[PDB]
């Protein structure tokens, strides 16, 4: 994997109308993957995890990793992560969650659910003042229901 | 093969 750098000219012509994003590191990133459960084994989840860790590193993030956590461990550790002092001096934040899920929630390795509303709240303007006015990216690799999409014919 | 998350 390689990330093409932006040009000095691109930066000069775009930085005034974008979020400030020049800190080094650009932000902290968390990649939390649950692969072993009770909820079948998530074959290929190891490839996903490795890919994101590599990507976020190449995008200039300091990457934190967690694997196979219970719902309670996820909540506690996401909160620890949101409360880290580094957020005051970085310009953005990334959180990637990869597991089984249902609409609005994701599973811990114990088959218990963590609500995504609870996750986002940890990073909000009230609970995470260090990230106020800074862009916060979330990527959620999880099912949101058990309905398989059969697809439809194009008319 | 492809499977459901």
């Amino acid at each position: 994997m390689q990330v093409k750098p932006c040009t000095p000219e691109f930066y000069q012509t775009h930085f005034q109308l974008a979020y400030r994003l020049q800190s080094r590191p650009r932000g902290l990133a968390l990649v939390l993957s649950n692969v072993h459960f009770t909820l079948e084994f998530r074959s290929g989840g190891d490839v996903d995890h490795s890919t994101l860790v590599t990507l976020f590193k190449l995008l200039g993030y300091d990457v934190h990793v967690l694997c196979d956590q219970t719902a309670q461990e996820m909540q506690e550790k996401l909160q620890n992560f949101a409360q880290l002092p580094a957020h005051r001096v970085t310009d953005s934040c990334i959180v990637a969650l990869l597991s089984h899920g249902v609409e609005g929630a994701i599973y811990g390795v114990d088959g218990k659910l963590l609500q995504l509303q609870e996750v986002f709240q940890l990073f909000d303007n009230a609970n995470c003042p260090s990230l106020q006015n800074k862009p916060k990216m979330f990527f959620i690799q999880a099912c949101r229901g058990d309905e398989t999409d059969r697809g439809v014919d194009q008319q | 093969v492809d499977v459901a998350d």
């Binding site: 994997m1 390689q2 990330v3 093409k4 750098p5 932006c6 040009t7 000095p8 691109f10 775009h14 930085f15 109308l17 974008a18 979020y19 994003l21 020049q22 650009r26 998530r42 074959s43 290929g44 989840g45 190891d46 490839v47 996903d48 890919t51 994101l52 990507l55 190449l58 995008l59 953005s92 990869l98 609409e103 986002f120 709240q121 990073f123 909000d124 303007n125 106020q132 006015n133 862009p135 916060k136 990216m137 979330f138 990527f139 959620i140 690799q141 999880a142 099912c143 949101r144 229901g145 309905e147 398989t148 999409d149 059969r150 697809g151 | 093969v1 492809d2 499977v3 459901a4 998350d5």
Partner: protein
């Protein structure tokens, strides 16, 4: 003085739509992460994050399941993103050099 809503300046990319399943391959991993890494690595230099997530949506819309003899053969997935962003989000990778 200017105050803030309780929640703002977030973007959330989801592998699938409400009510549905996201797809994953044993060898290549999840369709959505695979696409996300391909687009972000190629386009972070000149495209903002919401616009990259649109390119991801294009890739996912086009893919189909390969799983002969099960309910997943030729199945589909659609990704989405939700945004309370208030500006363009450029990652400006590798600047300054």
């Amino acid at each position: 003085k200017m105050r803030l809503p309780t929640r703002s300046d977030m973007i959330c990319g989801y592998a699938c739509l409400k009510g549905t399943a996201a797809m994953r391959n044993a060898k290549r991993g999840s369709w959505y992460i695979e696409a996300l890494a391909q687009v972000f690595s190629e386009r972070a230099c000149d495209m903002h994050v919401a616009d990259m997530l649109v390119k991801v949506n294009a890739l996912i819309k086009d893919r189909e399941g390969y799983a002969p003899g099960t309910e997943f053969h030729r199945c589909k997935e659609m990704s989405e993103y939700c945004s309370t962003l208030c500006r363009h989000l450029y990652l400006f990778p590798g600047h300054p050099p």
